[PDB]
Scaffold this active site. Sequence first.
Site, PDB file in Angstrom:
ATOM      1  N   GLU A  40       0.931  -1.084  -0.449  1.00 49.22           N
ATOM      2  CA  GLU A  40       0.201  -0.189   0.028  1.00 49.22           C
ATOM      3  C   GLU A  40       1.373   1.076  -0.097  1.00 49.22           C
ATOM      4  O   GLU A  40       0.961   2.256   0.308  1.00 49.22           O
ATOM      5  CB  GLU A  40      -0.758  -0.341   1.198  1.00 49.22           C
ATOM      6  CG  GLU A  40      -2.170   1.334   1.135  1.00 49.22           C
ATOM      7  CD  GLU A  40      -3.207   0.468   2.776  1.00 49.22           C
ATOM      8  OE1 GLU A  40      -1.967  -0.104   3.742  1.00 49.22           O
ATOM      9  OE2 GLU A  40      -3.807   1.247   2.839  1.00 49.22           O
TER      10      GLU A  40
ATOM     11  N   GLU B 223       4.904   8.205  -2.955  1.00 49.00           N
ATOM     12  CA  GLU B 223       5.400   8.036  -1.903  1.00 49.00           C
ATOM     13  C   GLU B 223       6.406   6.227  -2.060  1.00 49.00           C
ATOM     14  O   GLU B 223       7.082   6.238  -1.602  1.00 49.00           O
ATOM     15  CB  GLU B 223       4.824   6.948  -1.763  1.00 49.00           C
ATOM     16  CG  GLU B 223       3.153   8.204  -0.242  1.00 49.00           C
ATOM     17  CD  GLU B 223       2.492   7.875   0.360  1.00 49.00           C
ATOM     18  OE1 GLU B 223       2.363   6.134   0.628  1.00 49.00           O
ATOM     19  OE2 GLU B 223       1.162   8.016   0.493  1.00 49.00           O
TER      20      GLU B 223
HETATM   21  N1  LIG Z   1      11.317   0.799   1.511  1.00 51.25           N
HETATM   22  C1  LIG Z   1      10.735   0.661   2.801  1.00 51.25           C
HETATM   23  N2  LIG Z   1      10.410  -0.864   3.156  1.00 51.25           N
HETATM   24  C2  LIG Z   1       9.689  -0.836   4.397  1.00 51.25           C
HETATM   25  N3  LIG Z   1       8.398  -0.467   4.775  1.00 51.25           N
HETATM   26  C3  LIG Z   1       8.183   0.577   3.585  1.00 51.25           C
HETATM   27  C4  LIG Z   1       8.977   1.090   3.212  1.00 51.25           C
HETATM   28  N4  LIG Z   1       8.678   2.547   2.844  1.00 51.25           N
HETATM   29  C5  LIG Z   1       7.123   2.612   3.365  1.00 51.25           C
HETATM   30  N5  LIG Z   1       6.744   1.730   4.287  1.00 51.25           N
HETATM   31  C6  LIG Z   1       5.812   1.544   5.276  1.00 51.25           C
HETATM   32  O1  LIG Z   1       4.666   1.779   3.943  1.00 51.25           O
HETATM   33  C7  LIG Z   1       3.779   1.150   4.880  1.00 51.25           C
HETATM   34  C8  LIG Z   1       3.007   2.360   3.464  1.00 51.25           C
HETATM   35  O2  LIG Z   1       3.561   3.560   3.780  1.00 51.25           O
HETATM   36  C9  LIG Z   1       3.881   2.962   5.959  1.00 51.25           C
HETATM   37  O3  LIG Z   1       3.677   1.959   6.852  1.00 51.25           O
HETATM   38  C10 LIG Z   1       5.442   3.315   5.498  1.00 51.25           C
HETATM   39  O4  LIG Z   1       6.677   3.258   6.548  1.00 51.25           O
END
Ligand SMILES: Nc1ncnc2c1ncn2[C@@H]1O[C@H](CO)[C@@H](O)[C@H]1O
Lengths: 621, 621, 318, 298
Positions: free
Chosen positions: C116, C125
Amino acid sequence: RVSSGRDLNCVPEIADTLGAVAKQGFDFLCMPVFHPRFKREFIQEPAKNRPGPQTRSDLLLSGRDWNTLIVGKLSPWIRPDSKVEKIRRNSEAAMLQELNFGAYLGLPAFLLPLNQEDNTNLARVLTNHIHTGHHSSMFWMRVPLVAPEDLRDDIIENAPTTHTEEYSGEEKTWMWWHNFRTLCDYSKRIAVALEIGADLPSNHVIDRWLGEPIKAAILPTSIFLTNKKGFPVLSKMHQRLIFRLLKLEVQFIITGTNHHSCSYLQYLEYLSQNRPPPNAYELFAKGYEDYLQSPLQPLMDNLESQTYEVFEKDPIKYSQYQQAIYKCLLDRVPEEEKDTNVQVLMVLGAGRGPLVNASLRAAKQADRRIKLYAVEKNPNAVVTLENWQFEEWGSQVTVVSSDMREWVAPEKADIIVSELLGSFADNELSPECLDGAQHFLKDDGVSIPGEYTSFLAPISSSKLYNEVRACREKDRDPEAQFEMPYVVRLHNFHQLSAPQPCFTFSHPNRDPMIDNNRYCTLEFPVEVNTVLHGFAGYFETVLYQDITLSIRPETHSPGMFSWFPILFPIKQPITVREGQTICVRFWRCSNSKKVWYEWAVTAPVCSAIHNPTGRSYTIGL
Amino acid sequence: RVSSGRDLNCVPEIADTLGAVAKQGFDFLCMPVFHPRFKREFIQEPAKNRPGPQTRSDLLLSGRDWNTLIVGKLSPWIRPDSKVEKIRRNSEAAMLQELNFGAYLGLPAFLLPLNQEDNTNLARVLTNHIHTGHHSSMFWMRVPLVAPEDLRDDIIENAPTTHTEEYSGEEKTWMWWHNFRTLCDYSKRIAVALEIGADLPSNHVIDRWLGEPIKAAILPTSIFLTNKKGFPVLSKMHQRLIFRLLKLEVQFIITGTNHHSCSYLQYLEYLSQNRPPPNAYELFAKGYEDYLQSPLQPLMDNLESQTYEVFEKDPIKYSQYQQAIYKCLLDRVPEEEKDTNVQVLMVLGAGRGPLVNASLRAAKQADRRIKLYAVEKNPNAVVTLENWQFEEWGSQVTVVSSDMREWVAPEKADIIVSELLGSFADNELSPECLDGAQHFLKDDGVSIPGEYTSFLAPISSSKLYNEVRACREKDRDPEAQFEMPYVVRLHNFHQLSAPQPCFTFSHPNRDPMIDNNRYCTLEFPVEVNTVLHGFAGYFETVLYQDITLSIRPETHSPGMFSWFPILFPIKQPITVREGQTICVRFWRCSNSKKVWYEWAVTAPVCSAIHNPTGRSYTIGL
Amino acid sequence: ESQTYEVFEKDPIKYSQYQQAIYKCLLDRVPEEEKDTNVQVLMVLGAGRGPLVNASLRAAKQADRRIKLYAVEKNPNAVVTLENWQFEEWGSQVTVVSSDMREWVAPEKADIIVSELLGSFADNELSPECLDGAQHFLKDDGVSIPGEYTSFLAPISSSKLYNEVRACREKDRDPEAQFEMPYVVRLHNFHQLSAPQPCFTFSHPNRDPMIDNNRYCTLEFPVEVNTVLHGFAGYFETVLYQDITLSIRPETHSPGMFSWFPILFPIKQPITVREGQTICVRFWRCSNSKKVWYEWAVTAPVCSAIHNPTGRSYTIGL
Amino acid sequence: PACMERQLEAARYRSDGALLLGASSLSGRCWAGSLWLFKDPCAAPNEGFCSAGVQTEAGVADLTWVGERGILVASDSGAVELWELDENETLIVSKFCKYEHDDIVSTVSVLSSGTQAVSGSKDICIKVWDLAQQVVLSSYRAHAAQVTCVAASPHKDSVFLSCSEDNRILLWDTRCPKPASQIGGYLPTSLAWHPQQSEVFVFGDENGTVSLVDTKVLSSAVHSQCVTGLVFSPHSVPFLASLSEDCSLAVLDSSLSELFRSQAHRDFVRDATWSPLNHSLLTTVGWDHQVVHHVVPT
Ligand SMILES: Nc1ncnc2c1ncn2[C@@H]1O[C@H](CO)[C@@H](O)[C@H]1O
Ligand SMILES: Nc1ncnc2c1ncn2[C@@H]1O[C@H](CO)[C@@H](O)[C@H]1O
Ligand SMILES: Nc1ncnc2c1ncn2[C@@H]1O[C@H](CO)[C@@H](O)[C@H]1O
């Protein structure tokens, strides 16, 4: 006498080529920094893993030679705007590589071509390089006067050269450049290398390049008509263009092979020597071209001694002031009253005494009796005045150290004389200064000057627009630099419509409830396609009857150095099409403490009101 | 060879006096702009209505002479800090009058005296003139080394000269100046005209003037001891002071009447010629004195060719690099293994090949077999490398165009050599670069350098503090200029305590969970009264065993031009009394993208933490 | 923040759509004859406070297949909520991993990677970089949910929003930086001058030889009215699995989906557009090893300056 | 000369079987070119194992045979050169070096008679030359951008194809008062006439597509990068060999279907030449200094 360079795409031995080019008579060399045919790959194997050196070494030339004699060239295969994705991505990495290789050598300039309408990605990649590292390099865009598509031989059976006249279509190369510098945010590091063609386009097309940052002019050998003795020369239409570029001090570039089998360079030097000698104004203003200065406020500030000195080194204006007094003495004191009548002459705003001396010279030649008063508020000038009154003038000149608007004069005056005019006539606040000295004028007294009128003419100058941007300062409005006039010797510019009168002041002022505040609307018919950046301000003044002074270009008092045009800029440039009218509004506003101007453009489109309430610029009362 | 001027209070004929002064051998004249005895009134009648000229005329000299030869002087009766109200108000108007009269003439400098502890109103009136008009003039404050009260003859029966030793009391004239420039907000236009007296004060009192903007030195004729032939000379203690002022390039001023009945000027020229010849470092750094430059980041940025060239023009550092490799070859390959052993030498960060060549020279003199690898990430330097490998090096040198932290080497190395050090040793990020290249080092390999340590020493320099203020820029923190290091050849400064070690890095790094982040606290014993403005940073490195390089002043490698000290400034200056300890804290911080420093002073008083989280300055990884 | 994860969890529509996408992928991968013989390796990359992990569980109960979960998450604060869920309810089925999905050295490869990681402009994002770094540990036949996402752009007129972007000037920065950065905003007092067109498209997994996440797209917008252009509304669409999709494109909007508002890409100077004229915009997706950013310029009816050149006003941190 | 520069530009087999070689150094201190003759084609590119050799002042962008003695050269200097082999075929001597193009001469093609030629340049011009008088008869600025390729007709001395970066393919015929004629996507890069049908020709584009054109159309995606050249076999029913910047060679039939595919090259494949002696032998030079010999499966 002319800074010139040779353009080449074939430099087998960099040191040999430079030696030959310098022996020929050049000052610099435009050569490719990588071999023009050496296409490189940056994405797929195994051409991306191409071993060996990627170009010749930086050690082949000294740092001074790299910094002063080598203008780099983008490789002709680099097409950042290709319709093919792989060619675009390849050319992006390839373009940065050559720009960073030229930055690495500290090259004074680097050539990039504009030969199509769409150069968006080219601009993006250049803008991104300009914001990457510690630069200084100039970027000259090679753009032709006439598109190569519009100068091809009519030899294609099923694609004939369109014989119709398209005024705007003939100016397509200017829009190529205009759009490119808009994308690049008018970067002071992006200039034009204008390519001159075999047959000159229509003069309107040529005029489109006025006020543009042309740093170089590319003359290809093929444009030279061979003369009787077999030497290259240019047409009188081409010669006239060379003479216009010599005023802009561009660097002449000679490209292409020798077709008069140097002589081309020698012909340019011959042309340079056959230009008219520069007049007094021209030789004085050299150095001040398009240099923005602040308009002086002699009311609010005490002028320096060296400043009064330069205002005194203007013979024309003082001979015109003398003859105006000369005629007023005669028209007031008849020969039968020669020694019975003494005229009360008050030089309001006397400075270091040049008007007082002119008033004296005008009494010797008009043979009438005068009683002088030299009023001056700057106490430092008053020192020079009081030392003149002691050593030479005596009882005739009565020095008064006061503001003319405060002074309680002993008796009324026959003639009040003053030099309180700025480049926009009323910008040093003469209307307020002489109004305050009007009560002590005889009910039949003469003011010299008796009238002055300001003028305005719309202009295009991306060079000056860029110069006004550069004037941003900290701790103030980021846009204030566009809401204030500048005194400047306008030079790299195009005047889009003839000057029209703006504000007019008369002295003395017998109008019931006169009022010095103004509001004027001017409509400027524009016969060309262009970009409006500002309004040149000029002035005219009637000292006495037919004795006048002027800085209006079409009526300029010859040899008069004392003033340069004012420049009233606008925050955003305004596109103007041929046939459109530029409608400007100007206000002269005030309160008991300050006087200011406001101005807005209302056609073809509205602008924001500039300097509302003197937030960026006021003149101190 | 020495810029000198004559000080006078008697100029009957301004043109005659100047002619005589120039014929004497001077370059400028300090003379009063108004007659010193001519007291003027500005409040009550009838002395305020004093007629006639107030001084001589500006016409007596050309603009060039006024701008280059005349240093004005404030009239001795002007006492803005008087206890009498009428004298204060009178002297306020009188002071502005003479300053505005000097601004009117465009004088290069104007002298004002500091001869009492309270000069508050003097400062107020000067600060108000600096903010009034279009200036440029320099203001030299005439302040004595020893107060006239502390140098009077002990001839007053009921007021004897206090024979007690007062360390701080002997430095009262420095606090007169210190307080005056604090009131005036450290204006770059206010400098010191230090008056040297008959008997020199204690050396601590003299040392108080280090790092102060001394623009002129006033030598009165009465301080010259007459020699055997009857000509003026100075004591060896006075001569030493002259030699310290000659390093600061001050303008020598000769005041007072001729007592050796010019010769004083000729004695100064003799002294100037009898100074030691400037060494290589001294002659190279001339021009760069107290000029703040940005520390280079060769990791983040690709260094220019002309930059690599200057780093290659340092013979000492390359002869030291050669001998370090020379000793490592011998200590690794015994004479019996002479041709059986080939050492894998990897020059990580090769540049345009100066270390590769030193590695080659070190194999010819050590007579052992070497296999070279020249790793380099800057692709532009790689062009110079690949052209060297083709024209001279061959199969021995294997050019690698990559980042040493990415490179997947073919085999492990016996010796990794690098030149990745900044003025604060680890500021170009060598700890991260060699850590990333540590996996491909043999479990017994040697890194050159094997160790480096940064040093810090607290400093006083109002000249450098003022220079850091001048670095404010728009679109950023108004105080960011104080939260970043600067490479600078420190010159007009005082070092308040000897350098102490700060951060230390070793290669290779066998510590379990090494970590390159640091936190160090240093305590600096201060033996003098002073104002702390920054911390000079220096470095030392161990290439191999006893082969080292250093920029620590007390162990400086002679003739080594490659580095200048770093300057870590503080937002607010800190008063330090004699006996107090300056306690500084320094951090080396980082994340996966950036590396930065932070620093705070915690004694005698706390400062704010500078550069918290790299908001003003980061080093790119 | 915790209260932020909470609001992203209070969107039933998006979680029912995520469940059914997993529900269909379980059936299309594990036939009824393999019902208890096959355990699918489901990795929720970017797990948050466990709403996708719970949807993955609900999707195994209704699809009646065996699943082995992994909940990867880099935010250690969310990981606390995850580890307390794994203790109180989930157990051995869910293996909590406190790491960045691009660093993690997984024990075995995955059958399905679920995420997500989408912003209002889909890839804003940085999902393209996050799932690329987790692609090596995907089976040579694994399914990513979502498998595709596309950003959209539509030119707009809103002097109300143009004035609101001006008001965002701040000290100690570029006086014009407020116009070189996207804004999430519930556009309301506005006029959309041309229908949304697709901008950038990303697919997962990425089998293209030398894929590259950098982009350059040119869109031509036919304008039927006279107007003043102030910005470009950005929207998105995503294919979770086959016909199970999510959308914020106004004309295909997933009903009751609160989780996203349109993005607004502004321009420094408004541009007059006459009826019949085409608005030609260019958009770039740029990057380096540290940052990802967008650049954009209008090239018709007139040129604009290139906005955000080199991420001087706005970058997205990698 | 003691060496031949790594960038091999042209490979042309003559009637008896000798190999002509054009090469330039497109990197390093010196940017120059060289002409070499290999009576033993299997020796190439060995500088010592050559029959004749010469060095030109500037690079060799393209060349062609002028019968069995002379060589026509398109140089980076903007000049067109002619170099004829001596009586023994051991020396290469210059006859003319005429600088008529204001920029790099990129393409050259000899017209049917053998006494005339057509030069295409980056200066946008096209020139028709008289080799015997050593002068240019006509100059044609018909294109808008750089000329990529000029291909003189197999049998008509007044007919020749041209193609440029202006996206135009022009059919020429000096007999008409407006001699060019626009025939017709992606930019045209290579032009090859069919040796049996003087009305059919093939053109390769910058997107790797090769297409079949009848003067009064068929297409195939051969390469992944720009098509550098297209050369037909001497066979009575020829094969088409397509060079490319994707470092591969392909041999296609009449319907543009792939038969051969050679990845032997590690850099750009510049020129191809079929053997006069063995019609299943094709020689390909490249920028990787290789002179690879191919056995086409016939
Ligand atoms: N590269 C990443 N590795 C692990 N979790 C991630 C990464 N990028 C975003 N997230 C997490 O995924 C979720 C969705 O944005 C959030 O909880 C975020 O902190
Ligand atoms: N109101 C004023 N009263 C007296 N002199 C003035 C006044 N305004 C300007 N001047 C002086 O007039 C001269 C012309 O600008 C200058 O010397 C200036 O100082
Ligand atoms: N990590 C790195 N990898 C390779 N070369 C480097 C690295 N960091 C610095 N250099 C190079 O090392 C030299 C010394 O600063 C420079 O030429 C610099 O560009």
